[PDB]
Antibody, heavy 213, light 218 residues
Framework: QVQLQQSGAALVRPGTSVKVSCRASEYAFTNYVIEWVKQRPGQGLEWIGVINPGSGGTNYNEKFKGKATLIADKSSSTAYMQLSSLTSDDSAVYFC????????????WGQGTSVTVSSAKTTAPSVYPLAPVCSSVTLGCLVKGYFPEPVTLTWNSGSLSSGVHTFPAVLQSDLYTLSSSVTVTSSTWPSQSITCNVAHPASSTKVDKKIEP | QLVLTQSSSASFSLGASAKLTCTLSSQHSTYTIEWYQQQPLKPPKYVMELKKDGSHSTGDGIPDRFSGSSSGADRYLSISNIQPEDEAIYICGVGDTIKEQFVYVFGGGTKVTVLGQPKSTPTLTVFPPSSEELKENKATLVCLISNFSPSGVTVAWKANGTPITQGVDTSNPTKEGNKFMASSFLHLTSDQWRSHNSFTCQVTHEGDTVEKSLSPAE
């Protein structure tokens, strides 16, 4: 029942700031500390700070004073972290975590918030249906030349979930490309309409491409 | 001045016992630490709290194979059967409250590779350029590489029998369950695509080679 749910992926411009949010549930907010941690390049973790959501009492890693500002809203039951004047180095996954007022373990963690700090050009994906070359068939979908991450890609808007593989993205000259495959039976395709659904929130675009033989 | 020192990476043959070490700064040799497990593109996970005597309070979903020991400065993670799924970065942390001011500190982490593991060979899916992309005088060939372990592949493309370096983009592997998956793309022009008689995605995995080819003619 006890979850931390963090705000979505943020594209921030260098020299601007970003507010990331972490909402607690299924425990008493005021009787635990919320901690913040940065995923380090390569391997490791980097402690940012702690808020006591009762009193608003905050401490910090020396390195994050003037950089990080931890607020807590009792009403909304939400811990916030402002990160200021961002550079490429602030581009990382940030985790809110929970611990006892007793200086102990970070027992429950959020899913992470990916922050991208770039001046590169927000670009919606060109999306192409990948029909099989030349009882069952593997269809594909290419998502070429988008920025930033993320995209969300589904088949028949998630209604087709069995046999889906969505492959890690490549990055080249500030543009991502990604492909996804699904295997259905010949009795399904092409008698039924089958689409990949590509949403890119940063460009506010949604595309559904039909796979035609 | 709290300083958890771990070793960058550790390798144990499967099944065998794994003991990991988090040496505490001499000054704070008495402290309780936590242990954490970090797998790639997933939140790190509370493993145990570990006192100066040996007392270990393993967190939820941490099975019996994980246990705790303490030895002056050093603090130990013991994993009984170093199973495939234990492959991760193990990070230890510590908390301190000097004057109502609390600080938490992480070691650098220890990357555990499990060895003597049987391999899975990559299987290949290739797609040719969509008519739609061709209409635009561009042709992206798509190589999808699934169901491979461990994570190391190198990918090359050949046009007829000659290597192509230009317009090749290959992903980092990503862990899907106990195996890995990766993608490769060859960015051509529609003419480059219609000229050649074949194009080949070549994947090299642990001494093995898998190849799948497209005919533009079809």
């Amino acid at each position: 029942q006890v979850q931390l749910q963090q705000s979505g992926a943020a594209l921030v411009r260098p020299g601007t700031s970003v507010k990331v949010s972490c909402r607690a549930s299924e425990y008493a907010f005021t009787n635990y500390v919320i901690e913040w941690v940065k995923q380090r390049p390569g391997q490791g973790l980097e402690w940012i700070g702690v808020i006591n959501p009762g009193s608003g009492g905050t401490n910090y890693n020396e390195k994050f004073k003037g950089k990080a500002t931890l607020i807590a809203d009792k009403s909304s039951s939400t811990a916030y972290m402002q990160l200021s004047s961002l550079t490429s180095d602030d581009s990382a996954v940030y985790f809110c975590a929970r611990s006892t007022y007793y200086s102990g373990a970070l027992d429950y963690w959020g899913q992470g918030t990916s922050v991208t700090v770039s001046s590169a050009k927000t670009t919606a994906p060109s999306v192409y249906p990948l029909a099989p070359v030349c009882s069952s068939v593997t269809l594909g979908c290419l998502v070429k030349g988008y920025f930033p991450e993320p995209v969300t890609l589904t088949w028949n808007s998630g209604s087709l979930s069995s046999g889906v593989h969505t492959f890690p993205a490549v990055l080249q000259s500030d543009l991502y490309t990604l492909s996804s495959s699904v295997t259905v039976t010949s009795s399904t395709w092409p008698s039924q309409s089958i689409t990949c659904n590509v949403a890119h929130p940063a460009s506010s675009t949604k595309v559904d491409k039909k796979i035609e033989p | 001045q709290l300083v958890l020192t771990q070793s960058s990476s550790a390798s144990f043959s499967l099944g065998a016992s794994a003991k990991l070490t988090c040496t505490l700064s001499s000054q704070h040799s008495t402290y309780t630490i936590e242990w954490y497990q970090q797998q790639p593109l997933k939140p790190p996970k509370y493993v145990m709290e570990l006192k100066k005597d040996g007392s270990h309070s393993t967190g939820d979903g941490i099975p019996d194979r994980f246990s705790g020991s303490s030895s002056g400065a050093d603090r130990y993670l013991s994993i009984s059967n170093i199973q495939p799924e234990d492959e991760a970065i193990y990070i230890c942390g510590v908390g301190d409250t000097i004057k109502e001011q609390f600080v938490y500190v992480f070691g650098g982490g220890t990357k555990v590779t499990v060895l003597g593991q049987p391999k899975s060979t990559p299987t290949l899916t290739v797609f040719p350029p969509s008519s739609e992309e061709l209409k635009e005088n561009k042709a992206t060939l798509v190589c999808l590489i699934s169901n491979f372990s461990p994570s190391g592949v190198t990918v090359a493309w050949k046009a007829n029998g000659t290597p192509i370096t230009q317009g090749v983009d290959t992903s980092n592997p990503t862990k899907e369950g106990n195996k890995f998956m990766a993608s490769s793309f060859l960015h051509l022009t529609s003419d480059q695509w219609r000229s050649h008689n074949s194009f080949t995605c070549q994947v090299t995995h642990e001494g093995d080679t898998v190849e799948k080819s497209l005919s533009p003619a079809e």
